[model samples]
Target: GGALDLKTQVQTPQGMKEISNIQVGDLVLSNTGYNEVLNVFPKSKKKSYKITLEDGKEIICSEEHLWPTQTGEMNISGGLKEGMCLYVKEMMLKKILKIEELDERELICIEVSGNHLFYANDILTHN
Candidate 1:
């Protein structure tokens, strides 16, 4: 699945919760390890946007459903420059990957052990 449209689940003290349900400071599973919530952005129903990655990967998402970060999650929106480690479903641990400029913004292509590629924002917490 593409990044924007993809839904991820995070493990909370209350059990499993969807990424959409996460909040800032809420403890959730992270890519590297467990961490505390750093920031939270709720969905905005007013506007919708899309971004085309370097590989013609188009992510269509609503402003309301977009998640910039969760508890203990890395902030991709802060910056997605190269040499940054991000989490992916297929890959359980940090994997050094590559990204390239697709336009005014650089499109990140994440490499996983499963032979699939996705954006950094696709990361969700694990159990």
Candidate 2:
């Protein structure tokens, strides 16, 4: 295809029902910015990404900034489905640059990032 547009300002939608009480350090898991599952490594140096939450907020995190912690997952919210199984190690509100809804079910959400890695997404939960 032609050159992709990687330079785009992301926007957060209003009236997003915060499903989870996300904390700043809460361990989170998120896929690549793209809709489909992304490859662990991409050949393209320039690419576009979209990070979204159940609500209508989206963060256009760059590929370079998409790296997850050693634990494996990220703190970005990709809806209950993707992030539900992740570790909500902390809480973050203002830190979130953007958010947007990807799907109504499992609240298919996304976070714009360059890294397409599957991290721990692990955090022991005690009931």
Candidate 3:
């Protein structure tokens, strides 16, 4: 189950909302632009992965979550490496430095139509 930290912000029609604050029927940003939030997986307690970027930005997600790297490959933490930059905000590709595993924490994830992509904080991710 791919999930994210509550601290991650999701882009909504009115503005950005903490991932934990988002709900079904909310409109969110996607690869194609915007899409409706079709599903919300109830928050769960689990270990999370923290990916450190070149600039020190961190992305917290579950190990099963497929991170979209510049390689265009859909992969989880094990498949990710220190090299290519990731697609964060438009035109902004941040390089990953390393991955760290943390103890159990509350996590959440959502699915959307048309590409299933959305912004977690500023990083673009897929469901």
Candidate 4:
């Protein structure tokens, strides 16, 4: 998919040093381990950020739904098997649901329809 302009607000430690600001027509780079795809733009959908990446990949993530972090060092506890760490290559924020006893320290993996993303390495294993 192609678009008008786009930019990157997230600070990624690998691949590229600086993240550009996405508008409506710029192109973004996405590496899903198995393949590298171009994150393109066609138009803005107002309520949510409409993105059309290369290879016919497209999705809508809200402005607030986009996440930015200086480091991918989220302390993951519980349910993670020994030597098994969460290496999230890419992530998307879906509809926020209010749960009574969910810990911010943990990550819940909810499958997104037709969306598959990945992280490069595991900090736990490296450390």
lDDT of 1 by residue, 7-104 (tens): 43455667766556566666654444446655444433323334333333333333222222222333234353334443444344343343432232
Steric clash pairs (candidate 1) = 36-72, 37-71, 43-64, 44-64
lDDT of 3 by residue, 13-127 (tens): 8998998888889988866788888899889998888888887778888888887776675555557776767787774789888878887989987888777888777788887
**Worst ten in a row by lDDT for model 2:** 118-127
Clashes of each: 4, 34, 0, 16
lDDT of 4: 0.25
Q: Model 3 segments beyond 4 Å from truth? A: none
Error of 4 at 41 (Å): 3.6
Question: Which candidate should be chosen as best, given TM-score against the real structure?
Answer: 3
The global C-alpha lDDT for each of the candidates, from Candidate 1 onward, is 0.37, 0.27, 0.81, 0.25
Q: Is candidate 1 or candidate 4 better by TM-score?
A: 1
Sorted by TM-score, highest first, which candidate order results?
Answer: 3, 1, 2, 4
Best by lDDT: 3
